[PDB]
Amino acid sequence: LGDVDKFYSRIRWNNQFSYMASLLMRYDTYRKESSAFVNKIFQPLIVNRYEKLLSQRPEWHAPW
Amino acid sequence: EEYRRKYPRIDTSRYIPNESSEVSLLGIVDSYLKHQEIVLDTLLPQTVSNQWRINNDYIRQTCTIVEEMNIQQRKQINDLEIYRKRL
Amino acid sequence: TDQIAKNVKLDDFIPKRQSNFELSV
Amino acid sequence: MLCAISGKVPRRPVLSPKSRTIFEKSLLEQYVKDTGNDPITNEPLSIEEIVEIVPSAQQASLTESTNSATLKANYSIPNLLTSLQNEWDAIMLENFKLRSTLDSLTKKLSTVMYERDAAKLVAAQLLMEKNE
Amino acid sequence: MLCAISGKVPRRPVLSPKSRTIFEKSLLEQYVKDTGNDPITNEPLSIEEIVEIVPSAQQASLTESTNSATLKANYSIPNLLTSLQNEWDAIMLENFKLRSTLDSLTKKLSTVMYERDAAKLVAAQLLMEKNE
Amino acid sequence: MLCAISGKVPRRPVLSPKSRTIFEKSLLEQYVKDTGNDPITNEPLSIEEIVEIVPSAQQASLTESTNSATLKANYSIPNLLTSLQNEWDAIMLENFKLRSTLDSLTKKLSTVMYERDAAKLVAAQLLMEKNE
Amino acid sequence: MLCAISGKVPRRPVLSPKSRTIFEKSLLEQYVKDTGNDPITNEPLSIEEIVEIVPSAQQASLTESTNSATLKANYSIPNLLTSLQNEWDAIMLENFKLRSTLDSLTKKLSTVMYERDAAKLVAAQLLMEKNE
Amino acid sequence: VEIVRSLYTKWCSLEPGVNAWNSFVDFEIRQKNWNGVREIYSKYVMAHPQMQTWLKWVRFENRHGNTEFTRSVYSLAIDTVANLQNLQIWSDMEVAKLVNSFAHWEAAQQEYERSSALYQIAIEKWPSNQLLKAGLLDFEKQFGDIN
Amino acid sequence: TEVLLESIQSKVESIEQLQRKLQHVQPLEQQNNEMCSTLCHHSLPALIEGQRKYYADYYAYRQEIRSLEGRRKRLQAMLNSSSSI
Secondary structure (H helix, E strand, O other): OHHHHHHHHHHHHHHOHHHHOOHHHHHHHHHHHOOOHHHHHOOOOHHHHHHHHHHOOOOOOOOO | OHHHHHOOOOOHHHHOOOOOOOHHHHHHHHHHHHHHHHHHHHHHHHHHHHHHHHHHHHHHHHHHHHHHHHHHHHHHHHHHHHHHHHO | OOOOOOOOOHHHOOOHHHHOOOOOO | OOOOOOOOOOOOEEEEOOOOEEEEHHHHHHHHHHHOEOOOOOOEOOHHHOEEOOOOHHHHHHHHHOOOHHHOOOOOHHHHHHHHHHHHHHHHHHHHHHHHHHHHHHHHHHHHHHHHHHHHHHHHHHHHHHHO | OOOOOOOOOOOOEEEEOOOOEEEEHHHHHHHHHHHOEOOOOOOEOOOOOOEEOOOOHHHHHHHHHOOOHHHHOOOOHHHHHHHHHHHHHHHHHHHHHHHHHHHHHHHHHHHHHHHHHHHHHHHHHHHHHHHO | OOOOOOOOOOOOEEEOOOOOOEEEHHHHHHHHHHHOEOOOOOOEOOOOOOEEOOOOHHHHHHHHHHHHHHHHHHOOHHHHHHHHHHHHHHHHHHHHHHHHHHHHHHHHHHHHHHHHHHHHHHHHHHHHHHHO | OOOOOOOOOOOOEEEEOOOOEEEEHHHHHHHHHHHOEOOOOOOEOOHHHOEEOOOOHHHHHHHHHOOHHHHHOOOOHHHHHHHHHHHHHHHHHHHHHHHHHHHHHHHHHHHHHHHHHHHHHHHHHHHHHHHO | OHHHHHHHHHHHHOOOOHHHHHHHHHHHHHOOOHHHHHHHHHHHHHHOOOHHHHHHHHHHHHHHOOHHHHHHHHHHHHHHHHHHHHHOOOOHHHHHHHHHHHHHHHHHOOOHHHHHHHHHHHHHHOOOOHHHHHHHHHHHHHHOOOO | OHHHHHHHHHHHHHHHHHHHHHHHHHHHHHHHHHHHHHHHHHHHHHHHHHHHHHHHHHHHHHHHHHHHHHHHHHHHHHHHHHOOO
């Protein structure tokens, strides 16, 4: 009977229902999905400013 | 009241089980219940929240649009009253 | 509300060119 | 966007080119079969002129989630039959209300039209007496 | 289902693939022998292309039980649902026509009321100028 | 001809090319989409391999006129709804009977299977005790 | 209906005749002004060909006289009927599978009963040979 | 209370020193506004990435929060130092204290296997940290084996 | 019959437990109903009443334009009729 119930459920799913399918909770759902980073978990700076600064390079100049 | 008195209606109350009920009717009720159980256990939990979200979004956008239409209508009325005051 | 220290803004302290050295002036 | 006949979300949306309006395919096709005309403008319209709109998959989800018995936790076949009967009752009540209103409005309009014609007559009569 | 040649229920149903139509086996085989063509589309057809429809053993027991009153009940659920749908379409169209008439009457009522009041004002001016 | 699944006269008849059997379109499409197989032969079947049977104009007029002529006596929406409810009850009774019979048979089968294994075990033990 | 570019209910709906799809007027117009192509089909499209959909003033007036009950009623008779049809289809498939299973289970039960009796016969024979 | 809250929100938005953030946390603790303290810490670790800030947050969740949150904040700390390792923000001693604290907390929760996995994966990620190896020695001498 | 009554009672209890599980959606349904109520009972009727008022005012403005043209024509007609005696 259970296999039949599962069949009926899977039919009702396919024929209709399928068309209708805080920092820590966000972090947990991101952890589930995992089976820059800061801009995905936090939502606006300091770390972004520092990494953006570190990515660039100052122009070279000869010594005096 | 007249429509209810004259025309034959779907009587769901016949599904209420009683000790005097025929085995046939009890079996009908049992099958209805079993289908409802399967739907509530397996199907609705996955979709109901999404359906409510989708309907709420669509309705919210509809409300916004109809409010903007109301504003545009009041503007049209005022603009016309201005025109009528320039004649 | 945003009545407290209305004239003080974080962006006033941040150097605009640090995000892009080649910014045109 | 709702069907310009039912006021519900159309399950198969179609555009009339004459009124530039969206309808439920069944309803518009039936109206055109019965009248040969567009329901809004009364301009002539054939079935081959109707532009069927292709629903995106998101529109499908919208159509099945809007106005669906599957929104409520009392979903069951007996409850479906009862809800269907209830909607039929509401629609019959609406049709009754529409008829009763239209009758009352017809009577009020006829009254005000006779009043207007009487007023026009009085104005003309006064102008005639003043010009004699 | 009826054989497209004889108009009778076939004792050995066969499907032509070209026309996707049901025939009696002996009639389709004889027509193909005489002509080499499908009787509906006139496309060429061979006896090896004919698909003989096997009646299921359930269909055999059912075709004995088709004298049973439960198959004479012309009220199959799909047919009831479609009849309901057609009645819903019909009601929706009647309601729409009613609403449209009511709205047109309302716009007329307003127009007439404005005509009446402008007429009455003109009359009251003429009566003033007549009594002076 | 009846649908091999529903036992009713189909509304959109289709043929499986594997079983060479008539089905209702919606039912067969659903069964194929679930199982990937033909419901009778269990051979693998795709939805594109299904052959939609084209009804002749006499078949279309007969399906409409049988529905029409026999619903005509009880075509009121209230009678339609009552018939729908009664048909649902009939189906639910049949489903309940089926499920009950399957449950009873499953319990009996389980019993007999336990008896069979018990007997096999006792036989093997007697054979050991006789060979010592 | 949802704009195919934005996936939101459009504020100024337009139909592209090429893709037969609804878009937001601004989005579609801008896309054409930049690319000269329909955003779905990549077919050439001109701004003059775009059919702007008019949100009928009648639509608003029809959603007025649809009782608040019928707009709050998260049901549509089409959707109710389709839900009942999907239930009927599912239950038909279930009853079919039930019958097929019950038959298989009867055949299995008969087989297991024969195996049980054969085991019992072997056991009894070994017992008799052990007692002699 | 609401004016004090708006004052702290503005002050902290101006990126002040750690004293202002600590005071804001103390204020919400006085208000018994535990969700406010989570939100403040969620901002405070961005404004002041030093590992003592993360360890202040985990220290809060241990006394004023559930274990699901405590594990999630430790996982945020490790994922953060792993993704941002290329910036060399934290010294090795900081990452070491973070990993040791996380391992000892999982050891207290009787899930020694997850602390062992933590130590192995962390050592694999940062082989250059001797303090992390020593922390594994300190852990293994009381919860591990002789061999 | 007894087994049937037991099966029914068990299924009823199970169904009630499942419906209780689904109660977490009631806040969204309440928000929906409040939106629907505001749309159906306020925003639509107001839109239609505005439209009726606009239609009436537009017909009035059309009459006023016709009356101004008609004054200019009535003056011209008076002149021409006096010149035709």
